């Protein structure tokens, strides 16, 4: 795994589900450790996100202080389904 990922500024995308990782420690005072949804693009260099916190917190993000959730597919067998 190599090579640089950056296409310009917003490498998140509206509407993507998140989370706040322990490392906005220093900027968002025990505000960290909970799950978000972006909702918002901004440009600034300090926040790059408008995250919603699942308490109804609209808080200001960066790309280096949130991780992206996932919904899984990692249990289900997807080769051989015909319809419903």
Known sequence: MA?????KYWSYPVGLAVEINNNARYGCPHHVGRK???????HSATYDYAVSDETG???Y?????????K????Y????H???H
């Open 3 to 7: 090579g640089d990922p950056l296409p």
């Open 36 to 42: 978000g949804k972006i909702i918002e693009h901004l």
């Open 57 to 59: 917190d609209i808080t």
């Open 61 to 69: 993000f960066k790309e280096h202080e949130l991780t992206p959730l």
């Open 71 to 74: 919904g899984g597919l990692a």
């Open 76 to 79: 289900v067998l997807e080769h």
């Open 81 to 83: 389904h015909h319809h």
